[PDB]
Amino acid sequence: XXXXXXXXXXXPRHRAVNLFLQGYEKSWIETEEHYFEDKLIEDLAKPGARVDPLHQ
Amino acid sequence: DFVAKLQDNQRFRYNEVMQALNMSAALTARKTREFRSPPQEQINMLLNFKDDKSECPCPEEIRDQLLDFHEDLMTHCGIE
């Protein structure tokens, strides 16, 4: 039977720097590296001396 | 200058790994990077170190200088 089964089984320079610049801009600069969205309004709503700058 | 010091190092590592062939199964997977993977994704995947580690090649030496340049750029900009 095993024999039968066996029988059946047998049967260049500036391109690099340009691409480096593109990659650096794509995956290194816009990666969530600044927090100002609270201080800006905090110092914008102050009427230091009328209508506030943010109200304007 | 960064590209000047990175391209030559990549070519040097390619030459070294071709000199030390050591025929195995995974070397073709590690060498598809040169023939396949056009320069677009090539640079995209060889420039990645923001987390603890990535598949960065042996030039860990240029990562420090690029990080220094980025820190200089951000102190030049308005980011503290």
- Residue of chain A whose alpha carbon sits nearest to that of B78: A34
The tokens describing B47, both together, are 């420039």
CA-based nearest distance A37→chain B, Å: 13
| Burial (CB count <10 Å: 0-12, 13-18, 19+), residue B49 | middle
| Cβ atoms within 10 Å of B23's Cβ, excluding its own | 6
How far separated are the first and last CA of chain A, in Å rounded? 94
| Cβ atoms within 10 Å of A23's Cβ, excluding its own | 20
- The A residues from 25 to 54 touching B (CB cutoff 8 Å) are 26-28, 31, 33-34
For residue A39, give the H/E element and its range: helix A39-44
Report the structure determination method: cryo-EM
**Closest by CA position to A41, among listed A56, A50, A52, A54:** A54
User: Is the separation of the CB atoms in A17 and B3 below 8 Å?
Assistant: yes
